[model samples]
Target: EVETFAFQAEIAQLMSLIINTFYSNKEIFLRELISNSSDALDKIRYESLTDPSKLDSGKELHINLIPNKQDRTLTIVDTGIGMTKADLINNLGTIAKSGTKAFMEALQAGADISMIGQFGVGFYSAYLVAEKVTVITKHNDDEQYAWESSAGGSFTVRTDTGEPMGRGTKVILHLKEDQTEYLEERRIKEIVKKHSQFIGYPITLFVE
Candidate 1:
């Protein structure tokens, strides 16, 4: 069964901050996304240390970037611990660890802005350059599912029967009008190399 949920009130505020406050440096979206991919890879790798079976057979740990200029879309894929239905609701629906209230309270008090890390709201960064975002993921223990949102304070999650991702996650960004540069292979390669070159997993740029 599939389910849909609304973002917590705090997440709506965080989305606003990401879209409005970070407009000047929209490219940071790529950096934030790649960082998340790396973290996902690290999680699976760490789990494999105790149970060899946790590492799916024949699945390589890497990230792929597919740019579709004709469609003005950018996709980032990672072979890692894909999310389950409940995982999606908990992780994406609310700011983990109740950090949202603190993040806002700090901002209101004129506290250090670097404290943003305390809240795990980086996924919303995709909206900086995307009009809409789609996430397709498959986990070993759960069926594949797709989660979509437009930063409109609500999102939908449904079973995906189109194609099997095996065991990983793919994020599709529908580029905004002025963010078309993200659809260029060369531009994406530069951003990946400059910001995420040191990432532990292999990052590939697909151009067709």
Candidate 2:
């Protein structure tokens, strides 16, 4: 069965504050996503030392960027520690409600952009360019699920039966018409090189 949830109470407040405002730079959105992917890869790497099977996505951990010019989408995939259903509900929704307040407080106090990374509110940056974002993920302990948001007012989570990825997360951004530049090979490489040149895991871009 499929399920849908209102964007948590805290996120509703954030939508009001963040939905209407965007700082000048949009390219930095890529930086936020890539960082999350890298963090996930790191987690799986450390976890694998004990459990061994955590490397099921592949013995070599990495991130992949696939930009579909025709489809007007950009997908970021990572062979990392995937999130379970609860992980998705809480991490992407409920548990971080308090963190949302701190995020709001920091912005109200005129804090710099640096504070965003600490609170994990950076995922919302996807709305700066995309009309919709879909996250298809599989965790060792759970079946696959798709988490989707248009950043309008709510988000949805439902079971998915795409290819068995073993274990990882796939984030697909459906680009807004004006934000189509991100679907270009040149633009993607430029942004990745500028922002994540030295990120720990290897990042591969699909050549198609």
Candidate 3:
């Protein structure tokens, strides 16, 4: 099952800013993605400790970074709680966070405007590096789904015919020409350690 949504006007502007000039450090994109994947793994680990049987499946709570210089693609894979189609759009395409309205209102009211992080716009941060991004996810509650976008106002969500990953997510980033730093094994490992070392779950960088 797949569905898509149009970005709200403010969200469109936000996306443009994010894609253009939001982060001074281009590598913050990797931090945001790893942070999100850590959060997902943390959620499943916490829940499964109580249920025990939830761990019966072959899912492993870890993050894997696979860099393919040949194809200029970097894939981040995690065995964590995956999202459904609605989640893909709502989390990435819209400014539906609780703090977004307040942030917008603050900008309108001529306030200091420094607290937007409280509302959470992390998922869309992927646009900072990816010319094109693809998410292949298998949810516990639904069939596998694929979400792809170039971070414009529109995105595509569709049922995936690919093999189900048991329960988890894989995000493939087709790095933009300027974002090629992420394709290096040592660079990615350093970035992961620098930004994501404190994350609750283990994050591994896989290179061939």
Candidate 4:
């Protein structure tokens, strides 16, 4: 039910590069992740345009940001089109389809922040503030799976037995000591307002 995979060599290199390249702009990690969620949410919405059942009995569509102070973790869950195990491997295990040298050169030239998404590796932005990251996802056609990775190491994926996800992806970030500021509600709200003010989906935070 569990499997571990090494990150592609290029992805491994880009991982550290992302952490260092965006050192000063670390807070954008939230922006990048939220942007990804928005993409997934929009994707499901459009797909449902052709296939109404994709809505699955009128399930609510939204994103929730949960901060667990005791665990020192920040969780972002989106009711979007989740991924299968293959999708997790294909999506999280690799970065761009080209050589790392090209990306390195781009970074050396003071790369534009927007290029991260264009290169299809915006998810790595999580490493800017987290030592570890976990993704729990459930696609309509596949069972739930969890993908976990460390900052500078390999990643693992396994069939998750926790509560059902209904549908979508949930990302949990284990914050680095210096990045614990992300666990604060006020800070999370500010970042959402600053960068994700107009996200089409309703992104809410839990209180309790």
- Judged by lDDT against the true structure, how good is candidate 1? 0.79
Q: After superposition, how far is residue 158 of candidate 1 from its true place, in Å?
A: 0.2
- Candidate 2, which segments miss by more than 4 Å at Cα? 112-115
Clashes of each: 0, 0, 0, 0
lDDT of 3 by residue, 56-110 (tens): 5545788899999888899899988888766776755444544456655765565
Q: Write the per-residue lDDT of candidate 2 for residues 1-208, one digit (tens) a residue.
A: 6677778878877665554676657787788888998888889888999998667667878899998888888999998888999888776676568778888789878974445657887777777788889999988889988999887677789989788887888999999898988888888899998889999988998976
Best model number under TM-score: 2
Overlapping backbone residue pairs in candidate 4 total 0
CA shift at 156, candidate 2, in angstroms? 1.4
Candidate 1 vs 3: which has more TM-score: 1
- The residue-by-residue lDDT of candidate 4 on 151-206, one tens digit each, is 57588889999988789999999998888888887888888998889988888988
Against the unseen true structure, what C-alpha lDDT does each candidate score?
0.79, 0.82, 0.74, 0.82
Q: After superposing candidate 1 on the true structure, give the runs of residues whose Cα lies further than 4 Å from its correct spot.
A: 94-97, 105-118
Question: Candidate 1, residues 27-136: lDDT per residue as tens digits?
Answer: 76887777778888888888888988977633599999898888888999998888888888785555443676777777777753344554655567788889899999
TM-score of 3: 0.84
Candidate 2, backbone clash total:
0
Error of 2 at 118 (Å): 2.7
